[PDB]
Design a protein around this ligand. Structure first.
Ligand code: 074
Length: 253
């Protein structure tokens, strides 16, 4: 039976990644962020907390040849296939500089007010695939790789998505991003105004209902100043902006 609400941060609080919001910076790497966040969560959840890792967004973004155009956007299935086949090393944000390959780009404000420099309009070029851990990290790159066993698309059915998240952990999901999404501050989003800006990829961590209105609870990769402390909610059950139609995940065992 599916509960009225679910929050992965509450089910698996030993796994620090689940409540961590990241910042993709001035790069169209949402595809890689939703992937390594949900892979970090699932590596911990599915290993009973043995793997406590923050997986490197830059390793996936820079080294997966089949995942698309890097800082110009990517593709979800091949990202999870790369995790299964090649694996991904560890790496934190630029500012924290922990792990094998921390992210090279700084935090910035994405279409919203706050204390970080504005992201502005320029996009960085995709970083090179360097295959080298930072000097202080004393595991060689190939030996820091964490690999999945399987990956898959989740059925485009609300209950199937809920069951998947509650049993196996947060999922990555794509949706169509329209101009009014870049004005989101709080609440339950639905597309009302603006034209399409293409696809966006995020991490669904749970669901809930407020004033009879059902929603998905989602982490964006635009830092903690955007939205509801980095999260947003979106209508659930009506394939709003195709949110139930592009769900991808995988398992380590
Ligand atoms: C998703 C992605 O990264 N989208 C972009 C984005 O979020 N950016 C680009 C610059 C910084 C950040 C921003 O706008 O603040 C942008 C196109 C959203 C409007 C990426 O394009 C992707 O991989 N999409 C396909 C997912 C299946």
């Amino acid at each position: 039976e599916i509960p009225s609400s679910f929050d992965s941060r509450k089910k698996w609080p030993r796994c620090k990644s689940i409540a961590t919001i990241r910042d993709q910076s001035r790069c169209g790497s949402c595809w890689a962020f939703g992937a390594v966040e949900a892979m970090s969560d699932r590596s911990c959840i599915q290993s009973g907390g043995k793997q406590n890792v923050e997986l490197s967004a830059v390793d996936l973004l820079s080294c997966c040849e089949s995942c698309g155009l890097g800082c110009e956007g990517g593709i979800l299935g091949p990202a999870w296939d790369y995790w299964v086949k090649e694996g991904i090393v560890t790496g934190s944000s630029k500012e924290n500089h922990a792990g094998c390959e921390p992210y090279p780009f700084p935090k910035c404000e994405h279409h919203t007010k706050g204390k970080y420099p504005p992201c502005g309009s320029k996009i960085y070029k995709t970083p090179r695939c360097k295959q080298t851990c930072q000097k202080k990290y004393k595991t060689p790159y190939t030996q820091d790789k964490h690999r999945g066993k399987s990956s898959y698309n989740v059925k485009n059915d609300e209950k199937a998505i809920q069951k998947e998240i509650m049993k196996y952990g947060p999922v990555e999901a794509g949706f169509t991003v329209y101009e009014d999404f870049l004005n989101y501050k709080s609440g339950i989003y639905k597309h009302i105004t603006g034209e399409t800006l293409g696809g966006h990829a995020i991490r669904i961590i749970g669901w809930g209902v407020e004033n009879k209105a059902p929603y998905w609870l989602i982490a964006n990769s635009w830092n903690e100043d955007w939205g509801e402390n980095g999260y947003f909610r979106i209508v659930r059950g009506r394939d709003e902006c195709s949110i139930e139609s592009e769900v991808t995940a995988g398992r380590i065992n």
